[PDB]
Design a protein around this ligand. Structure first.
Ligand SMILES: *[C@@H]1O[C@H](CO)[C@@H](O)[C@H](O)[C@H]1NC(C)=O
Ligand SMILES: *[C@@H]1O[C@H](CO)[C@@H](O)[C@H](O)[C@H]1NC(C)=O
Ligand SMILES: *[C@@H]1O[C@H](CO)[C@@H](O)[C@H](O)[C@H]1NC(C)=O
Ligand SMILES: *[C@@H]1O[C@H](CO)[C@@H](O)[C@H](O)[C@H]1NC(C)=O
Ligand SMILES: *[C@@H]1O[C@H](CO)[C@@H](O)[C@H](O)[C@H]1NC(C)=O
Ligand SMILES: *[C@@H]1O[C@H](CO)[C@@H](O)[C@H](O)[C@H]1NC(C)=O
Lengths: 68, 403, 184
C-alpha cells in the first residue's frame, strides 16, 4: 500500500513492486500477492492469475452426452 | 397443485486482511521505546505470526468457498433455455463489471499504524467464478463436478430433478409452461424483494460494523493516559525526569500492549467464527449447488431442487428453488387390496379412493391410474392385513389372450 | 524463551535480585517479573485454547466423515473424494487420521441425440429409469451414467397422457413381446 513516487518497477493495486517485471501473458498462480497478482520464478515475473482453461461446452435443444 | 418459490439466505465468507505496525502502534520515533521494547522477550512476534496466519486463513477461505472447479465454463449464445428467463441470474457483457443485475443491486445496497491488506481475489474473478458455476449448473446439469462436463438439455434435467424427490417426470411435460411462468414470476418477485426489504441484509453489514468498530476502538484506546502522567510521547519523555519517566512510559506501553492483545483476542475469535461460517458455506456450495441434496431444510424450506449462487462483497448469497405443494384434497385409503384370497401392495405409491372406486397414485401428486398387476406385488394371504378392503384388480392384456 | 526476559527489571534471575538488592525494591522487581510472566502464561493459555477450538472443530468434521462415508455409503456429492462415492478406508496416523477415498469418474464421453418421449398409437411413452438415446438412425434407451443401449420395450416404459400436450416428442415404434408371443 505505498505509492512509490518518492522511493524494473511495476505498479500493482497493492503498493509498489520492485525487482519483478510485468508480463501480459497469464499463468497459474504460485505465490499470492493480492488484487489478482501472482508472481513465480519462470528471472522473476509478475502476471495476472489464470482462472483456468476456457472449456466452453456446446448447447442445443436436443443434444445429450452419455459416458461409455 | 404445486407452487415453485425461491428463498434467499446469505452466508458470510471472509473479511478484509489486517496488518498492524507493532512498534509503530506501541510508540514511535524513540530510542528509549526501542530499548524498553526489545527487553520484553517477545510480545510482538506472536501477534504478527497470528495475524499473518489469520490473513492466510481468510485467503484460504476465499479459495475453497468459491473455487471448486478447475474450468471456466462459458454460456452458450442462445438465450432460449425452454421459455425460462435466465436474465437476472446469468451475467451480461453490457455491464462494465460483468455482473448480474441481482449482484449489482446487492453491491449497491451494501455500503495510526494500522494497514488493511487488499484481498487476493477481488470482485471480478469472483463474478467470473459465479458465471462459470452457473454455466456448469445450467448447460451441463449436475454431472460436471464429478468428472468431465456433459451436454445436458435444461427440461429433461428439470425432469431428473423432479425424479430425485420421488415424483414421476411426466408431470413436468404436461405443465412446462406453468412451471416456467411460476419460476419467472418468482424471480421477478425475489428481485423486487431484495431491494424492497431493507432488513434482508444484516449480518454482513453488522459484521463489517463489528470490524470497523474494532478498528476504531484501537485508535480510541491509543489516546488514553493509562494512569500515567500524560499520553503523548514527546510530552512524557522530555518534561519528566527519566528516573520516573521510564516507569511512566513502561506503564503506558504495558496498557497499550494489553489493549492490542485484547484486540487480537477479539480478532481471532471473530476469525474462528468466520472460518466456521465459511466451512458451512463450502458445505452448502458442494451439496445444494453441485447436485441435489435430498435432506429437508438443508437446501431450502421444502423439497430441494437446485440453487443459483451470486457474488457478494465479503460473502456469498444463495438463491434456492423449492418444491412446495398445495391444494390439499381429502381421500379415503387402505393399506392393501384383497382379491381372490391374496393381498396386493402398492409398488410406488398408495391406494387412493374418492368414492366407491379405487386408484393408485404417486406420493406427492394426484395421478389416478387403474389398479393393475404391473405396479402391484403380492405377498401372503388375505387373513392378516388390518384394514384391508375387497376390490377387484384389472388383469393386463386380458382381451388379448382370447382374441 | 520468556524466562530470559528482563521485564523492565535489573535481571531475569530470582536468585540474582534477592541476593544483590534490598527487599523493598526487590519487591517491585519481583512484582514486575511475576506480572510479566503471568501475562505471558495467560497469552499461552489463550493460544492453547484457540488451537483447541480449531482442533475439536476439525475433530468433529473428521468424526462426521468417519461415520458417514466410512461406516456407510454417502450419497452427498463432493463430500468424500472428487467424484461419485464408492468406498473409502481409514489409515492410522500420529495425531490425526488419513482417509483413502475411492471415486468413480465417468470419462471418455460421446454425445448423441435424445427425445423426452416417444409417440406410438396416439399415446406418449416415458422411460421409468433411463433416457431415450438415438445414434442417428434407430432409437435406444440406456442408463444415465453408462452407455449400454437397449431396445424400447413396454416392460421398461410407462405411458401417460397423449401426443399433443408433450412437446418435443418423436414418432417411433415400440417393441411389445406379446405380438411375437401370441402367434407362436
Ligand atoms: C501515485 O502518484 C502518481 C502521481 O500522482 C500517480 O501517477 C500514480 O498513479 C499513483 N499511484 C497510486 C498507487 O495511486
Ligand atoms: C432451440 O430453440 C431456440 C429458440 O427457438 C432456437 O433459437 C435454437 O436455434 C434452437 N436450437 C435447436 C438445437 O433446435
Ligand atoms: C394450479 O393452479 C393454477 C391456478 O392458480 C393453475 O394455473 C395451474 O395449472 C394449476 N396446476 C396444477 C398442477 O393443478
Ligand atoms: C428475461 O426477460 C427480460 C425482459 O426484459 C429479457 O430482457 C431477457 O432477455 C430475458 N432473458 C431470458 C433468458 O429469458
Ligand atoms: C371418483 O373418481 C373417479 C375417477 O375420477 C370417478 O370415476 C368416480 O365417479 C368418482 N367417484 C365419485 C363418487 O364421484
Ligand atoms: C446405430 O446403432 C444401431 C445399433 O447398434 C446400428 O445398427 C446402426 O447402424 C447405428 N447407426 C449409426 C449411424 O451408427
Amino acid at each position: 500500500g505505498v505509492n512509490c513516487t518518492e522511493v524494473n518497477v511495476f505498479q500493482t493495486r497493492a503498493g509498489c513492486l520492485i525487482g519483478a517485471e510485468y508480463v501480459n501473458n497469464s499463468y497459474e498462480c504460485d505465490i499470492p500477492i493480492g488484487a489478482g497478482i501472482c508472481a513465480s520464478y519462470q528471472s522473476i515475473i509478475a502476471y495476472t492469475m489464470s482462472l483456468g482453461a476456457e472449456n466452453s461446452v456446446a448447447y442445443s435443444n436436443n443434444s445429450i452426452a452419455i459416458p461409455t | 397443485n404445486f407452487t415453485i418459490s425461491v428463498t434467499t439466505e446469505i452466508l458470510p465468507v471472509s473479511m478484509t486482511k489486517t496488518s498492524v505496525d507493532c512498534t509503530m502502534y506501541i510508540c514511535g520515533d524513540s530510542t528509549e521505546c526501542s530499548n524498553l521494547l526489545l527487553q520484553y522477550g517477545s510480545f510482538c512476534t506472536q501477534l504478527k505470526r497470528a495475524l499473518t496466519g489469520i490473513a492466510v486463513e481468510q485467503d484460504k477461505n476465499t479459495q475453497e468457498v468459491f473455487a471448486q472447479v478447475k474450468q471456466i465454463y462459458k454460456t452458450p449464445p442462445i438465450k432460449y433455455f425452454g421459455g425460462f428467463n435466465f436474465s437476472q441470474i446469468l451475467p451480461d457483457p453490457s455491464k462494465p463489471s460483468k455482473r448480474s443485475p441481482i449482484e449489482d443491486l446487492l453491491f449497491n445496497k451494501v455500503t495510526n499504524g494500522l494497514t488493511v491488506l487488499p484481498p487476493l481475489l477481488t470482485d471480478e474473478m469472483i463474478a467470473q467464478y459465479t458465471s462459470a458455476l452457473l454455466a456448469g449448473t445450467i448447460t451441463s446439469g449436475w454431472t460436471f463436478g464429478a468428472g468431465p462436463a456433459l451436454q445436458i438439455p435444461f427440461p429433461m434435467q428439470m425432469a431428473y430433478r423432479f425424479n430425485g424427490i420421488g415424483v414421476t417426470q411426466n408431470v413436468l411435460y404436461e405443465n412446462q409452461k406453468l412451471i416456467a411462468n411460476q419460476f419467472n414470476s418468482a424471480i421477478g418477485k425475489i428481485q423486487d424483494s431484495l431491494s424492497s426489504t431493507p432488513s434482508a441484509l444484516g449480518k454482513l453489514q453488522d459484521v463489517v460494523n463489528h470490524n470497523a468498530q474494532a478498528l476504531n476502538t484501537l485508535v480510541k484506546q491509543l489516546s488514553s493516559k493509562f494512569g500515567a502522567i500524560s499520553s503523548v510521547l514527546n510530552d512524557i519523555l522530555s518534561r519528566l525526569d527519566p528516573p520516573e519517566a521510564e516507569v511512566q512510559i513502561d506503564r503506558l506501553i504495558t496498557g497499550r500492549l494489553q489493549s492490542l492483545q485484547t484486540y487480537v483476542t477479539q480478532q481471532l475469535i471473530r476469525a474462528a467464527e468466520i472460518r466456521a461460517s465459511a466451512n458451512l458455506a463450502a458445505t452448502k456450495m458442494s451439496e445444494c449447488v453441485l447436485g441435489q441434496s435430498k435432506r429437508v431444510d438443508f437446501c431450502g424450506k421444502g423439497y430441494h431442487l437446485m440453487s443459483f449462487p451470486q457474488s457478494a462483497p465479503h460473502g456469498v448469497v444463495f438463491l434456492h428453488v423449492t418444491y412446495v405443494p398445495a391444494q390439499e384434497k381429502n381421500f379415503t385409503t387402505a393399506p392393501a387390496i384383497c382379491h381372490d384370497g391374496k393381498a396386493h401392495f402398492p409398488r410406488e405409491g398408495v391406494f387412493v379412493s374418492n368414492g366407491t372406486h379405487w386408484f393408485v397414485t404417486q406420493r406427492n401428486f394426484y395421478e389416478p391410474q387403474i389398479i393393475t398387476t404391473d405396479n402391484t406385488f403380492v405377498s401372503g394371504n388375505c387373513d392378516v392385513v388390518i384394514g384391508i378392503v375387497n376390490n377387484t384388480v384389472y388383469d393386463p392384456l386380458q382381451p388379448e389372450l382370447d382374441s
